[PDB]
């Protein structure tokens, strides 16, 4: 018969930016939490939880993936299509399931959880059909949530995580300089984004002995494309006087950093400058408002009042910031740390957060477009350190090429 679950440990362990002690403390924090709550094993299934505790980021082509952490073991679960890449990239053990049987993944989970009675899973990620299948394949097992305690444990970044986040912020600035240098009246958006992403990919591949070059992208928006922070790249021609939006996102070992700057082609008028100068002032004040001990709601309420002074709150787009770490445009984000009005979570030293005030003026109104700056701050004992070094306002953001 065919193989259902096997080990395909092809090759040796790959380089990782994190030490063995750093990947060990992460897997031990789970073990310490499971022992406090009488949880026998943990089964992670999402991109971000698996990449955090194992260091390996999986590709989801409709297949299930997992990682089981017992009180003594740590094992990732991957598919035959992946071969040995998951074992080379994972901290710990690794097993493989095949496509020849619909329940081969649950066969693999069962091998790593024999004897367990309380398994912790991600209520954030496991869908309805998934939870029913896990219940059927593991009868007599009570399921508890670890997505929330894991989320809180990821909000406090270690020094090694901060060192990688600083390195991502450096690639952000390199991608920004390549973006500013490619902007000219008449260039399409995708030509700007191509040069911006190419420069970051080459800077990442040069800055590590081994690294996977994946997911890194750029959002270069002109004109009405700036009205949304996530608006994809188009083929629109940049015209002189158009509002612009620089957005660089290098992805390094699943970790995410961002540099976002509003720009203008050739020149900036007076009407749009009034909105730009005010949004920069809100950004500068927001940087002051990130301190250890301040609540997320207190930061949004104060900055919202600043928008009321100039009648700009009515055109707000989204929250003032979010947490960092293991996230991307298709995974992650710790919802506990969001600069939103109804979030009472206080900031703590070791958190990596952003300040990104955005105001959006619709078409048919002077200064129509989307205005947004974005910095990254590492919360310290007395304040926060800014790791985004790119120029912010109109002192150097008037691109005259």
By CB under 8 A, name the one of 24, 162, 234, 386 that touches its own copies.
234
Q: Smallest distance from the beta carbon of 315 to its own copies, in angstroms?
A: 10
Q: Which of 333, 376, 379, 390 binds its own copies (CB under 8 A)?
A: 333
Q: Which residues pair with 156 in a beta bridge?
A: none
Report strand pairing: 243-249 vs 217-218. Answer: antiparallel
- Of 4, 48, 190, 230, which residue is the catalytic one? 230
Please enumerate in sequence order all residues whose Cβ is within 8 A of that of 240, keeping only pairs 6 or more positions apart, or say none: 185, 265, 266, 267
Q: DSSP alpha helices (H): ranges in 290-358? A: 296-309
Please report whether residue 158 would count as binding its own copies according to CB under 8 A. Answer: no
The C-alpha angle with vertex 350 and arms to 340 and 353, in degrees rounded to 5, equals 30
**200 to 209, 233, 254, 352, 389: CA distances (angstroms):** 16, 17, 15, 21, 16
Contact status: 239 vs its own copies (CB under 8 A): no
Single out the residue of 230, 270, 311, 400 in contact with its own copies (rule: CB under 8 A).
Answer: 230
Single out the residue of 68, 165, 229, 296 in contact with its own copies (rule: CB under 8 A).
229
**Coil, strand or helix at 351:** coil
- 358 forms part of the interface with its own copies (CB under 8 A): yes
Q: How many residues bind its own copies (CB under 8 A)?
A: 84
Mask of contacts with its own copies, 292-321, x by CB under 8 A?
A: --------x---x--------xx-xxxx--
227 is an interface residue for its own copies by CB under 8 A: yes
Beta partners for 119? Answer: 41, 143
Decide if residue 36 touches its own copies (CB under 8 A). Answer: no
Say how many residues make up the chain.
401
Which lies closer to its own copies via its Cβ, residue 27 or residue 327? 327
Region 185-214 residues binding its own copies, contact defined as CB under 8 A: 188-190, 193-194, 198, 201-202, 205-206, 208, 210-214
Report d(CA 293, CA 55) in Å as an integer. 30
Query: Any contact of residue 152 with its own copies (CB under 8 A)?
Result: no
Site for its own copies in 61-100 (CB under 8 A): 61-62, 79-85, 98-100
When asked if residue 60 is in the footprint of its own copies (CB under 8 A), the reply is: yes
User: Contact at 8 Å (CB) between 135 and 121?
Assistant: no
21 counts as binding its own copies under rule CB under 8 A: no
Among 149, 250, 321, 370, binds its own copies (CB under 8 A): 370
**Residues with Cβ within 8 Å of residue 126, at least 6 apart in sequence:** 45, 134
Give, for 166, the enclosing helix (H) or strand (E): helix 159-182
Return the residue of 93, 173, 274, 341 that touches its own copies, per CB under 8 A.
Answer: 341
Burial class (CB in 10 A: 0-12, 13-18, 19+), 320: buried
By the rule CB under 8 A, 373 interacts with its own copies? no
Minimum CB separation of residue 171 from its own copies in Å reads 14
Nearest-angstrom CA–CA distance, 251 and 326: 10
Q: Which stretch binds its own copies (CB under 8 A): 26-34, 152-160, 328-336, 383-391?
A: 328-336
Tell me the window of 184-192, 269-277, 283-291, 391-399 that interacts with its own copies (CB under 8 A): 184-192
Identity of the residue, 302 or 349, whose beta carbon is nearer to its own copies in the bound complex:
302
Q: x/- site string to its own copies, residues 109 to 128, per CB under 8 A?
A: --------------xxxxxx
Residue 236 near residue 223 (C-beta atoms within 8 A): yes
Annotated catalytic residue 283: no
| Phi, psi (rounded to 5 degrees) for 356 | -145, 75
Q: Which of residues 249-278 bind its own copies (CB under 8 A)?
A: none
Q: Are the C-beta atoms of 295 and 327 separated by less than 8 Å?
A: no
Taking the complex as a whole, the smallest distance from the CB of residue 304 to its own copies amounts, in Å, to 8
Tokens linked to 220: 């270069």
Phi/psi at 309 (5° precision):
-60, -35
Q: Which stretches of 290-337 are DSSP H helices?
A: 296-309
- Catalytically active residues, by annotation: 230
């Amino acid at each position: 018969d065919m193989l259902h679950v096997m080990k395909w440990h092809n090759g040796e362990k790959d380089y990782s930016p994190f030490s063995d002690a750093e990947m060990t403390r992460r897997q031990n924090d789970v073990r310490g939490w499971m022992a406090k709550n009488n949880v026998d094993a943990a089964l992670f299934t999402s991109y971000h939880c698996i990449n955090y505790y194992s260091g390996w980021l999986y590709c989801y082509f409709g297949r299930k993936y997992g990682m089981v952490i017992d009180h003594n073991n740590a094992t990732t679960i991957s598919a035959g299509i992946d071969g040995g890449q998951p074992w080379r990239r994972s901290f710990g053990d690794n097993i493989t399931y095949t496509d020849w049987r619909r329940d081969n993944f649950y066969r693999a989970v069962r091998q790593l959880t024999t004897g367990a009675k309380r398994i912790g899973i991600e209520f954030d990620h496991v869908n309805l059909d998934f939870r029913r299948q896990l219940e059927e394949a593991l009868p007599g097992v009570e399921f508890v949530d670890i997505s929330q305690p894991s989320m809180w444990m990821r909000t406090i970044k270690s020094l090694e995580e901060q060192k990688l986040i600083r390195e991502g912020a450096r690639v952000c600035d390199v991608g920004g300089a390549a973006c500013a240098a490619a902007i000219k009246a008449g260039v399409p958006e995708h030509e700007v984004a191509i040069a911006t992403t190419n420069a970051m990919i080459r800077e990442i591949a040069k800055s590590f002995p081994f690294v996977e070059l994946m997911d890194t992208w750029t959002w270069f928006q002109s004109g009405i494309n700036t009205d949304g922070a996530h608006n994809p790249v188009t083929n629109r021609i940049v015209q002189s006087g158009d509002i612009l939006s620089l957005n660089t996102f290098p992805m390094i070992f699943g970790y995410y950093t961002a540099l976002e700057r509003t720009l203008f082609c050739d020149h900036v008028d007076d009407a749009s400058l009034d909105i730009w100068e005010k949004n920069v002032a809100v950004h500068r004040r927001g940087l002051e408002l990130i301190k250890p001990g301040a609540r997320c709601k207190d930061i949004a309420l104060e900055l919202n009042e600043m928008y009321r002074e100039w009648d700009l709150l009515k055109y707000r787009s989204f929250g003032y910031g979010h947490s960092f770490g293991v996230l991307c445009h298709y995974y992650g984000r710790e919802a506990g740390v969001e600069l939103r009005e109804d979030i009472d979570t206080e900031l703590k030293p070791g958190m990596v957060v952003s300040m990104e005030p955005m105001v959006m003026l619709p078409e048919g109104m002077p200064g129509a477009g989307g205005y947004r700056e974005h910095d990254i701050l590492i919360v310290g004992e007395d304040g926060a350190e800014n790791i985004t070094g790119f120029p912010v306002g109109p002192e150097h953001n008037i691109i005259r090429n």
